Amino acid sequence: IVNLQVEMIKQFHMQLNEMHSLLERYSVNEGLVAEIERLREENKRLRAHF
Amino acid sequence: IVNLQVEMIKQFHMQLNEMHSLLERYSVNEGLVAEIERLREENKRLRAHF
Amino acid sequence: IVNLQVEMIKQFHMQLNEMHSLLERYSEGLVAEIERLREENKRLRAHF
Amino acid sequence: SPNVLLQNLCCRILGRSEADVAQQFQYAVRVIGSNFAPTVERDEFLVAEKIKKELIRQRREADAALFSELHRKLHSQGVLKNKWSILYLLLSLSEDPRRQPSKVSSYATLFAQ
Amino acid sequence: QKSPNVLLQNLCCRILGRSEADVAQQFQYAVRVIGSNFAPTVERDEFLVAEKIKKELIRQRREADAALFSELHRKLHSQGVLKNKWSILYLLLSLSEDPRRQPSKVSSYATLFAQ
Amino acid sequence: MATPDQKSPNVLLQNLCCRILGRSEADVAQQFQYAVRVIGSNFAPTVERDEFLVAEKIKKELIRQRREADAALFSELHRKLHSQGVLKNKWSILYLLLSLSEDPRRQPSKVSSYATLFAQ
Amino acid sequence: MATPDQKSPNVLLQNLCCRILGRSEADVAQQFQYAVRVIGSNFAPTVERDEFLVAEKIKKELIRQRREADAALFSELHRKLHSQGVLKNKWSILYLLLSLSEDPRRQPSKVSSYATLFAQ
Amino acid sequence: NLNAVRETMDVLLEISRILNTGLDMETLSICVRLCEQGINPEALSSVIKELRKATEALKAAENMTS
Amino acid sequence: NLNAVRETMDVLLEISRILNTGLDMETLSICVRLCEQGINPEALSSVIKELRKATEALKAAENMTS
Amino acid sequence: PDDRSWLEHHVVHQYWTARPSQFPHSLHLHSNLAAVWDQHLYSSDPLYVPDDRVLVTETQVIRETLWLLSGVKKLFIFQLIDGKVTVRNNIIVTHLTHSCLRSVLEQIAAYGQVVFRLQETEAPFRTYQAFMWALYKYFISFKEELAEIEKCIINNDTTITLAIVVDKLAPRLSQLKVLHKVFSTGVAEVPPDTRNVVR
What is known about its subunit structure (chains A, B)? Predict the structure, then answer.
């Protein structure tokens, strides 16, 4: 029973990490957030240069 | 059996908390909205300064 | 107990995959809306 | 590699392509990756005796003799490194022909779609 | 007094011989197991655990390991340094390996899930 | 010969749930999902797959409940059912009936209203 | 059906958590959620639902713990409680009390502070 | 050595047939190779049971889709 | 007390060696200190088993990739 | 089952089945006296655990009472235990207190128990045959009135209350009490081992 519990916990941890990675891959507006921040910086630079 | 039940409840709670944290980290398009608003304000400033 | 553990792990995996598919289904629309609004604005400008 | 061999075995037994058995392969990998307590018996002779007793319990005395002969042949051949483990596996997978296979209720098929 | 988590992490790194970055999945699994409710150990009595270990070693014809275990237990009892002897005895019993049984070399097949 | 449209086990289970709850199929959707989860779960083989062994176990259980007359009646009914030969899976039906037997002597442990919290 | 204004199981669980932990209801919210999860889980039937069987088990356990005087006191208190007839579910209370009995000779395995490590 | 392997495989197939295990020569050879490579017999037994259940589900799905 | 602690750690190391536990002096000392400090022996045993399983999986992966 | 369920809803509720038939009733204090009493009990004693009570219709209670008085065995509300008609403990009516309903039903059950003892008569001998014949004629005369009451209940045109039924049966109930005492003295008091001549 202890072995089963430990194995289940390990599998849960591995599955949680895999789910985190999968959600990061499929949720991933983060690249879009970075590109929007880059466009904001470029617009700020165009405002400072004008 | 009681230990197993308690472990299952604990694992369910932990997994729910981990899912909440992962969804908060990866879903959160709030940063992308803020960066788009920032790029809009920067473009407005670049238009007003030109 | 071993059978229960293995079945539970299999069910967890299957349920995770099903949940992933359901979330993908329930979470292209933006692109189509953008295209429609672009078409509409171009049509308005041409008509104008 | 053992993984490729297991995949080929699954494909051969199921009669489906490797792509159609992906979920079963994942389940097998999960089961194998779990930490298991040490087996009850690691002695070839104890496993052979358990297999013989299990075959006799099903009133399959001819099958019990055939199993004992096959086990003797396997032991003399010396091809298997873990004779006790293989004998235990075969005993564990043995099915009593007299005990009606608990027919997996058609209801499991309802969720497959 | 290093926190038990940091000590366990250092122990894992030392035993496996890998960097913390290479053991992240194993560290997460270990943290999940340790934080998971585990069924009570087979024996939580120092004397009962010692007697069970002695009986198991004698039944397995491992008299040398039984004598070594008895000597180590006598030394631990006389030293009086450990407050929870039963816990250490249970751990040692759980980690005991039959020296006659060739360590079951983890089949390369476990690597399939590592990727 | 168009064997009466014996609706698939999922539909049959849904109808059974509706009958047991006394609600329409639409009102038991969560219960239907729970049923599907239970049915898809791997169940251990029944302890006894022998009709006569199951009948003897039922008689012994009734005797343990001090229902010796009920044990005799059960053995007689089991003999009659086996002789009738209408049921294809006598062992399975006997196991089901054994699982569904209720001890009249044990005062029903009134299910605390709290159990409903997990029903949602 | 005389249902005493029984504050909801949530309120009762909160009061229990506050009493056991010695903290306010606001500080036990995670523990309250854990309690709600535990209470909502389906539990197997108790080992004994018979008042006399529970009393005999309690007496045997007290004798095994060398508490023969406590076993006699328990039997007398049980007789008095049964005669009083105030409690509707004597078997449940007896089973709970038996399950909660602690041997004073076995040093309480002090729950290591380490459980807090995973909370973060 | 080859004759010994063939004899062992034939004996294993005969044992599987007499015991109604449902294993074919290729599956039996794979199981033998896995056991020789050190696979835990309890894990192997659980895997075999799961594989048999999966094979029955796959055969039922193939018969339903045909 | 220091001599007693050293003797206890040596005894534990000897027991591990006779039992072929695979524990080194530092890991054995950490386990002994944790148990003396009240750590649940089941948690410690599970941690040790998981670390050994991880080391065996890493060795199998290194041997399969080589 | 849907058409059958619609009929079952419109053909009188399965309350006689162990399935709980919830029926709509007026929440007026005079009409919800059972519910108001449950509320007061719930309000008054913090130790009060609500027992599971079966809600029965007054007309349903009347019908079951008539069936008991008609000599029907195996009633749901009134159970026959060791030849004694006993009321099921978990029965409640909207307009009666559990204790009051229990008392009235206990009086009715006592009369029913008397009838039940009288109902079991086999007639093995000429004198016992004559007594049985007379008893049958009496039971016929009682069943006539019982059937007329049942018919009036079935017509459902007029409000029939339990009090009205009890009053209607009062002369018959008195005759039944006298008959029960006379029968007990004439037959029940006769020792079983007495010679047929002596009996």
Answer: Interacts with FAM29A. Interacts with HSPA1A and HSPA1B. Interacts with gamma-tubulin in a HSPA1A/B-dependent manner.
